[PDB]
Amino acid sequence: SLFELGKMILQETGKNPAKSYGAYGCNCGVLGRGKPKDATDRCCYVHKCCYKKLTGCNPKKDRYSYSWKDKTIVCGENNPCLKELCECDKAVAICLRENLGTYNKKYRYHLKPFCKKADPC
Amino acid sequence: SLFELGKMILQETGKNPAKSYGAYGCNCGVLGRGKPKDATDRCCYVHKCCYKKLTGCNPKKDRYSYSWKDKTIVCGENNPCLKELCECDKAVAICLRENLGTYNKKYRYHLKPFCKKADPC
């Protein structure tokens, strides 16, 4: 669920997830997808396409188990949907961390009319 | 949908909805409800309870029509669920405006996990 997502994002990036990613570019936090503004935004794009793949569970609402083991997010589910959901969330958190280097605050609260249509997932 | 909600919030409060209300206190934004931090947060609390009453539409994704008439949000007829949704959104936007005077930025990006469990709606 978004709780696990947010926790993962905090754990990977060390950043408050809402402030940094609650509305970043065309894909992070905002409703739906848009052409990514940058790598950070692209993480969220990928994440949303990751969500679109899921069948069996609700990415927003469904809680799942994961662990922090040797400073790695370790998904703790066997259920295929929750596992993939967890892995979607893990991937985005990692991706966000990995792209902090090009994170650009100007994309915080990016305005939707500046978003081009996203490529299909 | 979030689009109309954000627009109404913008219209009523004059504030960028994502920045000001995308993550505020225990109730504004994602992660359901929690004991409210302040009146602004209670607006979002009531809002979330309002959403729980909805049947037949998706508060997050379903767009609906409303008009700005005499500087008032006027929900379109839409259909019963969408109109009720519209009314939920209108109410929160109004509530947030009425309480802008005590908006406290310290609650922006409040870590919702650090929220006491909300009472049932």
Curated annotation (Swiss-Prot), chains A, B:
GO terms for molecular function: calcium ion binding; calcium-dependent phospholipase A2 activity; heparin binding; phospholipid binding; toxin activity. The record marks K112, K117 as: Cationic membrane-docking site (MDoS). Changing Y109A: Important decrease in myotoxicity when injected into mice. Decrease in myoblast membrane permeabilizing activities. Decrease in bactericidal activity. Important decrease in calcium-independent damaging activity against EYPC:DPPG liposomes. GO terms for cellular component: extracellular region. Disulfide bonds join C26-C115, C28-C44, C43-C95, C49-C121, C50-C88, C57-C81, C75-C86. Changing K48D: No change in myotoxic activities. No change in calcium-independent membrane-damaging and myotoxic activities. Shows no hydrolytic activity. The record marks K105, R108 as: Important residue of the cationic membrane-docking site (MDoS). One of its GO terms (biological process) is arachidonate secretion. Changing K53A: Increase in myotoxicity when injected into mice. Increase in myoblast membrane permeabilizing activities. No change in bactericidal activity. No change in calcium-independent damaging activity against EYPC:DPPG liposomes. Changing D38A: No change in myoblast membrane permeabilizing activities. Changing K112A: Important decrease in myotoxicity when injected into mice. Important decrease in myoblast membrane permeabilizing activities. Important decrease in bactericidal activity. InterPro entries: PLipase_A2, PLipase_A2_Asp_AS, PLipase_A2_dom, PLipase_A2_dom_sf, PLipase_A2_His_AS. PROSITE patterns: PA2_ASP, PA2_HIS. This is Basic phospholipase A2 homolog bothropstoxin-I.
